[model samples]
Target: KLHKEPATLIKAIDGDTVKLMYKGQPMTFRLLLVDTPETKHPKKGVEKYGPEASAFTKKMVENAKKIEVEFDKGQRTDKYGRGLAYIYADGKMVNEALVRQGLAKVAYVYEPNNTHEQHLRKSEAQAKKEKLNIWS
Candidate 1:
């Protein structure tokens, strides 16, 4: 683990974003490499697949017995100051899960955070081929 920390989900903003209690403080994190549709964005509002994606993420995060986050060896925060990290629920990667399920598109490929893009890309291809949700 490069830089991993235990965390608890405080709130799920959407499929691709959340607020977590990390180190005893609430911090928002943009789940790295996975961009689900916009359910909560003011401008975008609720897209076709956004609500389902958010429900998927919220359920996974809320029901997780344990959760942790890992930094990708790059700058930890985005321009908006949201923490950029990969979320794991009981060691199952939530980001990858979303991609595999075809609810999320792999994005924000700023380097050094390339650690898990391979997994997402591969998963997405299968999802795309099978045509699930957003891919469908």
Candidate 2:
């Protein structure tokens, strides 16, 4: 069931989540191996770096020509029912892009499900070394 499918970038819910149109159905996807600061939460409000992360995600996917989502082989969805995926915008992996841009950090890991964990961590490290937005 782990297959790459084309989707329309409908909305960037946050830095690490997005809503997409797949087969005429709306699907919410949580970017794999990345965690952005919280932008929602009545009590917490917007956390530091949250706005920048949101903006980055918006710019990356809001107007992309094509969005392709590949689900994790281990688990397709999380407990909250959001699809766990590695999204590609115009063929570029957006998950790694966010980490490379310092808009997100290496987050949860579920063994073999984390196909890009090492690459993501390296990207985060490079961003930190360069003092990118979140790292700065």
Candidate 3:
């Protein structure tokens, strides 16, 4: 159901987007099922804690080595032509990490991926518990 590897992160596009170099190819991910407040956009300004969310993500990924890339549907290229993926690092899934940190909320624009969606909910719970980001 998944593949693991020591991939290198190339950039943190925002709180939810990350670019990585894997297998010699640039891969992008959109932390699935969780949308933190907007950190960057042409028209949208930062949400309450958007900066902290972005900074936290950058800290988690910047100069960090090794991320696990899991393939799945709804993995189509986003509007920017970047591959949308769900990532894992060490043993913790990145998307789930956001939820657990409470920086994002559970959301789905298509058929729910029930098999792994629990992670999103758990991430949010942790955020709520710690009073991180928006909850703060």
Candidate 4:
């Protein structure tokens, strides 16, 4: 079974990162198994389609009525101490959404965190076939 938590979005840091109000305190979460382009990294600078990814994420979370988080079976925290989880906005999985639109790629697999791996791949294929955004 998956561990799920109810939360509210505090702010969207970038394409694949967000700060949410979890259990009273604000917590940062990195979208598990998803990698969006770097919008403003130190050396990476602004990547192609990065701003679009960030905008899309912001739009989804900002317009969401109810936000939820689903955690994988692996470690809950990353080296940066950010929580690893899949985000859902109004019952829609935002992680796969990004992949479907080619705003993100399904990377960083570490077993046990593949609860929706097949679905992600399917979405990624759809994006790839259509040559959307990052795929293009």
Candidate 5:
């Protein structure tokens, strides 16, 4: 079963990281099943489409009237201590939204942790075929 909690979005820290408050505690989440281009890299710095991806995510999160985080079956958090989760906003899966819109890529798939891999891959394929965003 997924660990579920109601969360209030605090800020979007680029395309993938989001800060939120849950049960009065602040937490950061690294979205699972997808990876967006980096806008804040120290050396590589602002990859192509990074800002667009960030803007897309920021808008989605900010517009949601309600948000919830669901942890996967295996590990709870990433090495950096950010919560590994699938974010649902207004009953929609934001991770899938990003992939479907071609704002992010399917990445870091590990067995037992990637429950949405198949769905995300399908979305990626559609995005690639349509040449959306990064795929373009």
Candidate 6:
């Protein structure tokens, strides 16, 4: 389920989910684990720094180009048959990086790809301490 095109990361909906440029095809991604504050799902009730989660994500990704995705065992297809991948930008794992930063949360689910879970947890802790969005 991979599409070839110059990609543009829309915004970080959380530490996990993100929107992208799919050649005018509206597409959004929800990382397996790494749940950040809730924003889009108004029904879920905003968590700590939920809006900031989106804002921070908006900053990291937005105008990236030629991005590549790496698929794991369950890659290229999810339960709903959606494609799953690790986004890389210029040799950087944008997905993991987001966790390393305070912009996202490390959520472990399903098979548990602990690839960058530790680092993501560390960053999430720091962000929580400082109350980037929830502290205040």
Candidate 5 clashes between residue pairs 3 or more apart in a chain or in different chains: none
Worst 10 residues of 5 by lDDT: 1-10
Best by TM-score: 4
Query: Taking the tens digit of each residue's C-alpha lDDT, what string does model 3 give over 62-112?
Result: 644557766555544667776656777665677777777777777774553
| lDDT score for candidate 4 against the true structure | 0.92
Off by over 4 Å in 2: 1-3, 41-43
- Which regions in candidate 4 have their CA more than 4 angstroms from the true location? none
Better of 1 and 5 by TM-score: 1
How would you encode candidate 1's per-residue C-alpha lDDT over 1-136 as one tens digit per residue? 5766799889999988989999998999999998889788779799888999899989999999999999898999999989999999988889999999999999978888888888899999999999999988
Two-way TM-score contest, 2 vs 4, winner: 4
Q: Model 1: residues >4 Å from true position, as ranges?
A: 1-3
Query: Residues 1-136, candidate 5, lDDT per residue (tens digit)?
Result: 6666799999999888899986798888999988899898778889998998899889999999999998889897888888888998888888899899889999979878888899899999999999999888
lDDT per residue as tens, model 2, 11-115: 888888899987798888998999888698458979998898888788989768888998876877889888889999888889999889888889978886887
Q: Compute the lDDT for candidate 5.
A: 0.89
| Pairs of residues at least 3 apart in sequence or in different chains that clash in candidate 2 | none
Model 6 accuracy (lDDT, Cα): 0.58
Model with the higher TM-score, candidate 2 or 3 = 2
Q: What is the lDDT of candidate 1?
A: 0.91
TM-score of 6: 0.62
> What are the lDDT scores of the predictions, listed in order?
0.91, 0.86, 0.70, 0.92, 0.89, 0.58
Comparing 1 and 3 on TM-score, the stronger one:
1
Model 4: per-residue Cα lDDT over 1-136, one tens digit each: 8966899899999999999999898899999988899797768989988899999999999999999999899888899999999999999999999999999999968898888888898999999999999988
lDDT of 6 by residue, 15-77 (tens): 456666555665666564566666766577766667776665565565454565555444445
Local error of candidate 5 at 111, Å? 2.0
lDDT score at residue 37, model 1, on the 0-100 scale: 90
TM-score pick, better of 3 and 4: 4
Q: After superposition, how far is residue 134 of candidate 6 from its true place, in Å?
A: 6.4
Residue 42 C-alpha lDDT in model 4: 69
**Sort by lDDT, top down from the best:** 4, 1, 5, 2, 3, 6
